[PDB]
């Protein structure tokens, strides 16, 4: 009746002991929660039958969410989430190998426009076309 979602999570180049300290696996938006053990794997318990999006939330490195469909009989499967055209199936192996995609990009870099950017000004061209018109 009640099933468990297993998985793993590894960030390339960084040992788990450095990032698992403040990371939580969420099964369907805090409605179920779990914590990753020392090696990096994670297990979530007390999951009823249905469909749930599993995401490894961690401020250091983001993780791509993965949908998991578990049936009443017991067979259960994983795939890529797609909130549009949900009928599609893109299978992903059940022992979730949710490899991280590096640190996220919360910050946006400064513009720091150069003189070469000033070279082709739309305003300058749109105001110098009348200048050629004014001369002519």
Ligand X SMILES: *[C@@H]1O[C@H](CO)[C@@H](O[C@@H]2O[C@H](CO)[C@@H](O)[C@H](O)[C@H]2NC(C)=O)[C@H](O)[C@H]1NC(C)=O
Residue 3 touching another protein (CB under 8 A): no
- Is the CB of 60 or the CB of 92 nearer to ligand X? 60
How far is Cα 103 from Cα 25, in angstroms, rounded to an integer? 17
- 118 CB-contact burial (10 Å; exposed 0-12 / middle 13-18 / buried 19+): exposed
Of positions 1, 12, 74, 108, contacts another protein by CB under 8 A: 108
Of positions 60, 76, 81, 92, contacts ligand X by CB under 6 A: 60
Min dist CB 32 to another protein, Å, is: 8
Q: Give kind and range of the element (H or E) at residue 16.
A: helix 16-19
How far is Cα 34 from Cα 83, in angstroms, rounded to an integer? 23
* Number of residues located near another protein, criterion CB under 8 A: 37
Min dist CB 6 to another protein, Å, is: 11
The stretch near another protein (CB under 8 A) out of 46-54, 70-78, 93-101, 119-127 is: 46-54
Give the pair of three-digit tokens for residue 24.
């939580």
Q: Are 60 and 20 in contact (CB under 8 A)?
A: no
Choose the contact partner of 51 out of ligand X, another protein, none; CB within 5 to 8 A by kind: another protein
């Amino acid at each position: 009746d009640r099933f468990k979602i297993e998985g793993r999570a590894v960030v390339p180049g960084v040992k788990p002991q450095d990032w698992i300290s403040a990371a939580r696996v969420l099964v369907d938006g805090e409605e179920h929660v779990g914590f990753l053990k020392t090696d990096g794997s994670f297990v979530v318990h007390d999951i009823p039958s249905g469909s749930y999006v599993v995401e490894v939330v961690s401020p250091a490195y983001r993780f791509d969410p993965v949908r998991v469909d578990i049936t009443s009989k017991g067979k259960m499967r994983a795939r890529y989430v797609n909130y549009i055209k949900t009928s599609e199936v893109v299978r992903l192996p059940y022992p979730l190998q949710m490899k991280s995609s590096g640190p996220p990009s919360y910050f946006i870099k400064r513009e720091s426009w150069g003189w070469t950017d000033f070279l082709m000004n739309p305003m300058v061209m749109m105001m110098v076309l009348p200048l050629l018109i004014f001369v002519l």
